[PDB]
Amino acid sequence: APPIMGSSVYITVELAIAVLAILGNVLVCWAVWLNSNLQNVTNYFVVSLAAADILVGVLAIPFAITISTGFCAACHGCLFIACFVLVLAQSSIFSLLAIAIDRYIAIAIPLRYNGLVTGTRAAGIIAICWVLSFAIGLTPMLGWNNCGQPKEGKAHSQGCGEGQVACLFEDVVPMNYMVYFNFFACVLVPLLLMLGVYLRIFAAARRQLADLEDNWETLNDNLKVIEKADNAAQVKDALTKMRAAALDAQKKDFRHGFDILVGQIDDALKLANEGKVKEAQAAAEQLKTTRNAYIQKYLERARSTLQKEVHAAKSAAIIAGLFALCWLPLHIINCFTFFCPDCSHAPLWLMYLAIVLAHTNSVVNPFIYAYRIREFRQTFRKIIRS
Ligand SMILES: CC(C)CCC[C@@H](C)[C@H]1CC[C@H]2[C@@H]3CC=C4C[C@@H](O)CC[C@]4(C)[C@H]3CC[C@]12C
Ligand SMILES: CC(C)CCC[C@@H](C)[C@H]1CC[C@H]2[C@@H]3CC=C4C[C@@H](O)CC[C@]4(C)[C@H]3CC[C@]12C
Ligand SMILES: CC(C)CCC[C@@H](C)[C@H]1CC[C@H]2[C@@H]3CC=C4C[C@@H](O)CC[C@]4(C)[C@H]3CC[C@]12C
Ligand SMILES: CC(C)(C)CC(=O)Nc1c(F)cc(C(=O)Nc2nccs2)cc1F
Ligand SMILES: CCCCCCCC/C=C\CCCCCCCC(=O)O
Ligand code: NA
Numbered sequence: 001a002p003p004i005m006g007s008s009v010y011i012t013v014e015l016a017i018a019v020l021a022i023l024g025n026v027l028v029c030w031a032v033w034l035n036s037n038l039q040n041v042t043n044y045f046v047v048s049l050a051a052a053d054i055l056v057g058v059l060a061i062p063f064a065i066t067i068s069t070g071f072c073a074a075c076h077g078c079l080f081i082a083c084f085v086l087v088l089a090q091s092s093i094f095s096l097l098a099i100a101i102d103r104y105i106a107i108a109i110p111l112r113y114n115g116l117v118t119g120t121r122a123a124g125i126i127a128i129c130w131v132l133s134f135a136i137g138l139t140p141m142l143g144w145n146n147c148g149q150p151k152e153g154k155a156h157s158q159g160c161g162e163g164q165v166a167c168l169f170e171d172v173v174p175m176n177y178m179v180y181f182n183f184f185a186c187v188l189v190p191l192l193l194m195l196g197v198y199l200r201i202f203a204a205a206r207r208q209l210a211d212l213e214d215n216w217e218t219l220n221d222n223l224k225v226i227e228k229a230d231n232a233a234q235v236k237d238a239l240t241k242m243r244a245a246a247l248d249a250q251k252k253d254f255r256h257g258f259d260i261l262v263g264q265i266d267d268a269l270k271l272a273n274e275g276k277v278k279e280a281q282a283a284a285e286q287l288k289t290t291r292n293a294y295i296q297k298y299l300e301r302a303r304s305t306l307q308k309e310v311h312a313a314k315s316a317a318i319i320a321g322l323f324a325l326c327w328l329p330l331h332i333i334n335c336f337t338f339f340c341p342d343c344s345h346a347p348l349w350l351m352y353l354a355i356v357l358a359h360t361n362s363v364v365n366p367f368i369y370a371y372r373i374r375e376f377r378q379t380f381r382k383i384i385r386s
Contacts, residue, residue, distance in 0.1 A: 021057035021362035072160035087137030094129035257294030
């Protein structure tokens with residue numbers, strides 16, 4: 001069969017992916033521009049993400065079509081178009097790694113997040129990552145290439161001039177760079193780091209919740225210790241454990257709630273040190289009405305805020321998971337080409353399937369924000385309507 005027929009399916013799919021990559025991610029950046037709520041440090045890395053995704057459809061996908069033809073070109077010119085996609089991939093890894101750290105800081109030290117990260121500090125980090133993304137992605141340009149040993153038989157076959165080579169990815173980019181330098185160090189290592197970061201995120205989130213239910217049980221169980229106590233000392237051991245638990249749960253409406261609770265504990269605590277048993281048991285009963293009007297409000301506002309931060313971390317973890325699933329097949333084919341010389345090279349239909357699968361990651365991101373983030377979903381509607 002003619003080669004152009006099989007190539008017609010590939011180019012059409014490649015362009016279809018490019019259209020969805022530009023439209024979807026432009027819609028994300030326009031939503032962040034309009035909405036005031038969507039303007040925060042976490043979303044700036046989201047825009048830095050969608051920035052690279054647009055550049056895939058505008059440059060990387062057109063580049064990938066041009067390489068598929070094997071057109072004649074100078075080895076370094078062919079080297080830039082083949083390595084530019086490596087810059088955008090490294091940009092996305094740094095962005096995804098920044099989001100995981102951001103969500104880790106917000107859940108580990110909530111009362112220090114606003115003092116730690118700001119807008120201007122985040123904007124600088126984006127610049128540093130993008131500069132490093134060019135450096136890593138264009139390392140073969142600095143001399144780690146196969147230009148010194150060009151395929152001459154393939155060049156004269158298509159009648160390339162002197163200094164020109166048949167432009168193909170595996171022909172100009174060394175596989176050791178792609179396996180050791182690119183895959184292992186630059187791709188696999190940061191991906192494993194995100195897995196560890198997200199593991200600590202979900203660990204620290206649930207541990208604060210046995211903490212929330214533990215203080216709630218320390219407050220409830222010791223009330224029944226006072227209700228059936230015999231002596232003045234037994235009420236003291238129950239009130240002192242509640243007083244420490246009351247001070248542990250807090251760390252205007254929030255402050256005044258404990259002002260009545262901890263105060264009423266001292267009202268009964270002083271009556272216990274005097275020896276008055278019955279008057280202490282009555283003063284402790286006042287704590288129940290204070291519990292149903294202030295404490296249970298904070299038990300359930302804390303549970304609500306922690307659940308919304310876990311929902312945000314789950315949504316961000318999906319973006320990293322979809323990045324790993326989309327790119328790994330294209331990387332493992334590089335591992336087979338490099339490590340196993342006895343193996344027959346992966347067929348052309350599979351190579352086409354792996355490339356488009358790596359490109360699909362540009363489209364999948366805006367669908368996740370709409371399905372998982374409520375603020376993004378509402379903002380998309382008003383841009384579509386008008
Ligand atoms: C953002 C866009 C519009 C800016 C332009 C970038 C593109 C289109 C330009 C800049 C560098 C150019 C490469 C310059 C070097 C060569 C070597 C030659 O044998 C074939 C063309 C080729 C490979 C050019 C491809 C087009 C190229 C990649
Ligand atoms: C998430 C991480 C750990 C993924 C691991 C990918 C790498 C390390 C593993 C999984 C599949 C492995 C390939 C399994 C098959 C072979 C065939 C053999 O002749 C050489 C090694 C080689 C080619 C392995 C390379 C390493 C490989 C690519
Ligand atoms: C991590 C998940 C997404 C797994 C994806 C499956 C990929 C990486 C595995 C499964 C089947 C594998 C193919 C197994 C058989 C061949 C033919 C051989 O001559 C070279 C390797 C090659 C082409 C393997 C490529 C990698 C391959 C496509
Ligand atoms: C289809 C050909 C063989 C006739 C031309 C060609 O070589 N196409 C091609 C391409 F445009 C990009 C890549 C690529 O990006 N590979 C990566 N592996 C890890 C990160 S990126 C691989 C390719 F084979
Ligand atoms: C912005 C969305 C995508 C539309 C942009 C147009 C994409 C054009 C596709 C490929 C451009 C290059 C085609 C191949 C050029 C080399 C041909 C040759 O020299 O034989
Ligand atoms: Na991407």
